[PDB]
Amino acid sequence: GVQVETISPGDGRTFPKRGQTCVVHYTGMLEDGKKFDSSRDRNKPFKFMLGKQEVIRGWAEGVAQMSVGQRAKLTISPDYAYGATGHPGIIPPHATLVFDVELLKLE
């Protein structure tokens, strides 16, 4: 559902726990490489709570496999993203997404 490929290694030791806040920088792209959303453009990190289901499943599950300091490419199946419906106008049906994510810190 999500495949993680490292761009820059983290500490290899400090991985999120459920319920912690993950502070990340990210860029979300369609499989075509086109960016649809990016913290990053906004120059401000993004926060989400692991376990709250407030981000697509593949993003959360990919970040859960990352250590602090790690930057990685998350290739996310529609099954772990927006599914058959997509988000019309932004994400097409059955879209594979690619997120470039850096795990900055946990809070």
UniProtKB/Swiss-Prot annotation:
Activity control note: Inhibited by both FK506 and rapamycin.
Lineage, broadest ranks: Eukaryota, Metazoa, Chordata, Craniata, Vertebrata
Name of the protein: Peptidyl-prolyl cis-trans isomerase FKBP1A
Entry EC number(s): 5.2.1.8
Domain PPIase FKBP-type: residue ranges: 19-107
Reactions that this protein is recorded to catalyse: [protein]-peptidylproline (omega=180) = [protein]-peptidylproline (omega=0)
A Gene Ontology term for the protein's cellular component: cytoplasm
Gene label: FKBP1A
Protein's organism: Homo sapiens (Human)
Signal peptide coordinates: none
Membrane-protein topology: Peripheral membrane protein
Subunit structure: Interacts with TGFBR1; prevents TGFBR1 phosphorylation by TGFBR2 and stabilizes it in the inactive conformation. Interacts with ACVR1B and SMAD7. Identified in a complex composed of RYR1, PDE4D, PKA, FKBP1A and protein phosphatase 1 (PP1). Interacts directly with RYR2 and RYR3. Interacts with GLMN; rapamycin and FK506 abolish the interaction with GLMN in a dose dependent manner. Interacts directly with RYR1.
PROSITE patterns registered for this protein in UniProt: FKBP_PPIASE
GO biological process, one term: regulation of amyloid precursor protein catabolic process
Highest rank taxon of the organism: Eukaryota
Gene Ontology terms for molecular function: activin receptor binding; calcium channel regulator activity; FK506 binding; I-SMAD binding; macrolide binding; peptidyl-prolyl cis-trans isomerase activity; signaling receptor inhibitor activity; transforming growth factor beta receptor binding
First-level EC class: isomerase
Alphabetical UniProt keywords: Acetylation, Cytoplasm, Isomerase, Membrane, Rotamase, Sarcoplasmic reticulum
Similarity section: Belongs to the FKBP-type PPIase family. FKBP1 subfamily.
Residues carrying N6-succinyllysine: K52
InterPro entries, A to Z: FKBP-type_PPIase, PPIase_dom_sf, PPIase_FKBP_dom
A UniProt-annotated Pfam family: FKBP_C
Subcellular location: Cytoplasm, Cytosol; Sarcoplasmic reticulum membrane
